Amino acid sequence: SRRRVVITGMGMLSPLGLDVPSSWEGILAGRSGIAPIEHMDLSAYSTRFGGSVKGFNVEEYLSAKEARKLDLFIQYGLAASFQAVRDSGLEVTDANRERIGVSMGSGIGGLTNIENNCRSLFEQGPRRISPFFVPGSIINMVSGFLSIHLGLQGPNYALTTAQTTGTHSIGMAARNIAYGEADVMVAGGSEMAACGLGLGGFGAARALSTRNDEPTRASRPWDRDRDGFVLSDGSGALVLEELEHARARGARIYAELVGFGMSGDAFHMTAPPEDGAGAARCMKNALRDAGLDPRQVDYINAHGTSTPAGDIAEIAAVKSVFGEHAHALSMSSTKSMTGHLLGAAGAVEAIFSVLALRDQVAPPTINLDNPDEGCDLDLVAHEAKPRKIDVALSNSFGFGGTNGTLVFRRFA
Amino acid sequence: SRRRVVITGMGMLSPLGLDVPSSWEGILAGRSGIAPIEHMDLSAYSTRFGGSVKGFNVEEYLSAKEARKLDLFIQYGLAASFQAVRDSGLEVTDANRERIGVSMGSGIGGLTNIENNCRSLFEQGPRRISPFFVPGSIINMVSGFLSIHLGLQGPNYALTTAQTTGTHSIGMAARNIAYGEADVMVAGGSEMAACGLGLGGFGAARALSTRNDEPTRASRPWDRDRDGFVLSDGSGALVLEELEHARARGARIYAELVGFGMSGDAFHMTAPPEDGAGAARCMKNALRDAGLDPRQVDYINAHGTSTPAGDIAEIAAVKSVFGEHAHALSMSSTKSMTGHLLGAAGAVEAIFSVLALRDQVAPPTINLDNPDEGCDLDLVAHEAKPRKIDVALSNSFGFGGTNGTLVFRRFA
Ligand SMILES: CCOC(=O)[C@@H](F)[C@H](O)c1cc(Cl)ccn1
Numbered sequence: 001s002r003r004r005v006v007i008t009g010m011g012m013l014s015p016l017g018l019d020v021p022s023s024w025e026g027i028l029a030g031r032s033g034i035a036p037i038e039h040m041d042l043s044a045y046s047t048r049f050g051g052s053v054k055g056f057n058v059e060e061y062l063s064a065k066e067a068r069k070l071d072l073f074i075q076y077g078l079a080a081s082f083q084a085v086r087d088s089g090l091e092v093t094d095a096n097r098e099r100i101g102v103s104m105g106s107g108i109g110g111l112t113n114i115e116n117n118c119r120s121l122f123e124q125g126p127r128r129i130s131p132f133f134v135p136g137s138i139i140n141m142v143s144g145f146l147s148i149h150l151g152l153q154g155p156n157y158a159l160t161t162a163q164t165t166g167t168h169s170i171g172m173a174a175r176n177i178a179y180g181e182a183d184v185m186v187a188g189g190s191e192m193a194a195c196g197l198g199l200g201g202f203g204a205a206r207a208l209s210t211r212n213d214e215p216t217r218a219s220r221p222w223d224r225d226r227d228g229f230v231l232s233d234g235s236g237a238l239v240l241e242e243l244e245h246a247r248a249r250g251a252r253i254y255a256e257l258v259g260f261g262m263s264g265d266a267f268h269m270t271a272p273p274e275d276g277a278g279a280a281r282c283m284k285n286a287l288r289d290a291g292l293d294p295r296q297v298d299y300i301n302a303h304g305t306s307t308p309a310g311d312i313a314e315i316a317a318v319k320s321v322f323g324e325h326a327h328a329l330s331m332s333s334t335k336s337m338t339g340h341l342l343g344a345a346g347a348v349e350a351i352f353s354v355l356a357l358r359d360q361v362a363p364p365t366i367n368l369d370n371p372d373e374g375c376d377l378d379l380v381a382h383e384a385k386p387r388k389i390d391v392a393l394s395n396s397f398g399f400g401g402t403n404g405t406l407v408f409r410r411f412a
Numbered sequence: 413s414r415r416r417v418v419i420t421g422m423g424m425l426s427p428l429g430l431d432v433p434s435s436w437e438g439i440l441a442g443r444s445g446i447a448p449i450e451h452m453d454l455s456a457y458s459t460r461f462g463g464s465v466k467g468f469n470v471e472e473y474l475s476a477k478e479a480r481k482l483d484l485f486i487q488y489g490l491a492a493s494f495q496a497v498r499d500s501g502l503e504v505t506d507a508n509r510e511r512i513g514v515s516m517g518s519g520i521g522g523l524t525n526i527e528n529n530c531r532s533l534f535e536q537g538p539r540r541i542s543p544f545f546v547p548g549s550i551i552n553m554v555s556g557f558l559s560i561h562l563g564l565q566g567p568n569y570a571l572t573t574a575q576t577t578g579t580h581s582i583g584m585a586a587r588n589i590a591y592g593e594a595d596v597m598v599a600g601g602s603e604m605a606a607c608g609l610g611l612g613g614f615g616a617a618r619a620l621s622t623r624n625d626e627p628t629r630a631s632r633p634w635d636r637d638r639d640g641f642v643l644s645d646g647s648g649a650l651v652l653e654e655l656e657h658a659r660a661r662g663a664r665i666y667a668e669l670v671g672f673g674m675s676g677d678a679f680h681m682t683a684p685p686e687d688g689a690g691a692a693r694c695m696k697n698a699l700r701d702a703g704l705d706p707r708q709v710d711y712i713n714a715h716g717t718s719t720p721a722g723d724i725a726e727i728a729a730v731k732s733v734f735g736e737h738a739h740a741l742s743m744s745s746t747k748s749m750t751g752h753l754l755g756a757a758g759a760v761e762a763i764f765s766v767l768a769l770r771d772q773v774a775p776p777t778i779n780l781d782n783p784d785e786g787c788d789l790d791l792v793a794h795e796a797k798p799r800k801i802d803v804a805l806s807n808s809f810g811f812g813g814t815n816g817t818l819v820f821r822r823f824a
Pocket residue numbers: 107108109110111114133134137138139197519520521522523526546549550551
């Protein structure tokens with residue numbers, strides 16, 4: 001058998017806001033967080049915009065001195081993590097600290113830091129490399145610094161599965177609790193890849209929208225005029241908790257995590273298969289894991305990256321899995337508003353899926369002006385749609401054909 | 413209910429060999445793989461040596477067309493994975509491909525590629541970044557590329573837990589099989605951090621041995637004259653398989669994986685606690701997980717990094733866990749010979765722990781001329797010790813206070 005897992009705390013930095021309720025308000029109003037990137041000469045780049053975190057004050061979380069040691073992606077992950085633990089109301093003690101762990105991941109980790117230290121290395125040689133270069137850049141330092149700050153002695157690890165990271169981190173944290181390896185996990189992801197290397201890296205693959213004239217219209221999942229994804233920064237963290245542990249201390253429960261699916265496409269390094277066979281296996285695995293029939297799904301937070309092939313693959317996957325129910329569920333891409341937070345995408349979209357269940361509302365797919373061939377599902381074009389949502393799915397598909405699906409359900 | 417997990421295939425690149433048997437011959441003969449680094453000018457660096465993989469031929473594994481797109485750490489990870497899968501005798505079919513996954517991790521990933529593309533970006537501009545830069549550098553692409561080439565559609569992920577990566581990767585892959593998420597997993601890790609950024613970054617922390625005039629004597633775990641770790645490159649991969657699945661196909665079984673422990677120190681970003689409290693908590697979790705009396709432990713493959721604090725913490729941890737039995741078991745650091753393969757350390761060391769069981773021999777800790785204050789266990793100084801080994805333990809500790817222990821035993 002298996003223990004039940006609920007969500008008792010959430011935290012976020014996104015292009016829409018410095019916390020969950022501000023981000024969520026932007027989502028339900030169809031606001032874009034996409035803008036030209038500031039304090040950075042992107043003249044020579046084919047993309048000059050994305051989703052930046054605006055007005056982040058790390059000194060709400062850390063001393064100036066401790067913040068200087070950490071890449072922005074670690075600062076963001078720590079901010080989301082501290083918020084989520086505060087939101088949960090959990091009291092860490094000598095009696096429970098071995099039962100509380102962390103799995104905060106990243107797709108691309110410390111690019112800003114790598115970039116600044118390459119400058120020093122090429123210009124001045126190795127003796128100007130910061131002593132904190134390695135520990136201040138490694139992807140497991142959100143889990144590390146969080147565990148040290150809060151005295152957490154449970155399972156301590158970090159996933160890196162590109163654009164699937166946040167979904168896998170949360171799913172595998174849920175397994176830790178379900179199988180009795182922990183009672184509480186802080187799980188999610190963080191990303192800050194708006195450096196030359198991030199915009200340049202994805203730019204060289206021609207994976208990014210180049211709609212520089214209209215940044216807010218660039219992210220247009222399933223729209224016939226989409227031209228690639230929008231690079232965004234931020235973090236999501238959830239407090240996952242064994243149900244009886246949550247009930248005993250009187251925790252506020254947002255929702256239950258009932259299902260986790262993984263699959264590999266085994267198809268291509270960066271492109272999904274046209275028929276989304278991989279995404280379909282992963283969703284079927286997630287529903288089987290939850291003991292749910294495809295008919296019980298009401299809302300899907302799609303990967304919905306605004307790439308030609310990715311968006312169409314997800315429509316095919318959903319038609320395949322859900323058959324005669326495919327039109328009855330609502331599916332939206334909040335990436336239409338947030339852009340693509342890469343490893344943090346699954347973390348902020350799990351929170352948006354939980355909030356869809358709390359507020360009984362499907363967030364919009366903004367910019368869906370002209371649905372493409374075969375994109376005839378309920379994609380919640382333009383505006384939020386209040387509706388019955390008992391069961392919400394959150395999908396992530398990433399480089400290497402790696403797939404993740406989370407299944408959340410209303411808790412009462 | 414929880415299924416049993418066995419090792420049916422192993423694969424390796426190390427500073428001692430281009431496969432498992434050649435590496436193991438070097439381990440048993442007390443041979444060093446540490447030498448001045450040839451692939452770059454290190455005259456400006458405080459450390460100019462490490463454990464290089466010598467004479468690696470990627471055209472034994474991949475087309476030159478594919479190899480050119482991939483960081484060395486991915487090439488090393490794929491080579492070890494291919495060796496492991498072939499060694500297993502396993503045939504991938506439509507009947508089993510959904511039940512075979514991969515978890516190959518790395519501490520740092522494609523640093524050589526990142527540095528090279530950083531050079532291009534700063535000297536020439538963004539239009540000179542490779543289109544293959546992101547898919548060819550990011551840590552999950554060993555798992556990705558392996559799944560694409562072999563058609564593995566099971567769980568596809570990657571851990572990044574610094575120097576604990578290989579141990580965590582193997583442990584969590586065993587849990588996937590134990591809990592029924594997969595029947596087969598390819599798991600381990602790969603590292604190639606020997607570039608200016610890597611040697612410079614660890615050098616800036618003063619974490620590396622600076623014994624440039626005698627590199628083979630540099631890695632001297634528990635020796636009074638140790639001055640930090642030796643940086644090394646390579647890969648370890650194991651095929652983990654559910655017991656009845658292995659039995660049904662007539663697989664050769666090297667050993668059974670009976671125990672896995674994780675724990676966080678919650679102490680310091682980089683330093684282990686002097687008393688080894690987190691490592692003690694981790695080993696006790698692993699021994700309880702294996703249903704063992706601690707007196708059953710015959711051999712420990714220590715982390716044994718050759719740092720002042722790390723080495724003494726491990727003695728303290730082992731004395732605390734094993735009490736008087738601490739004096740009866742054998743513990744050695746194969747890092748004395750291989751140096752520190754970082755995220756690949758736990759993977760190659762898990763293989764050495766399994767071969768210690770097959771061959772009934774404790775590998776030596778070379779260079780242990782003058783054991784330090786309190787390092788008075790059987791540390792297998794200088795020469796391999798033939799001995800009874802029913803149960804072998806492999807430890808890893810990392811940045812972020814992240815701990816892993818694997819427990820292996822003979823299968824009859
Ligand atoms: C010192 C920590 O090193 C890392 O983890 C880097 F590889 C980093 O995360 C990264 C950056 C890029 Cl540009 C592509 C893929 N990964």
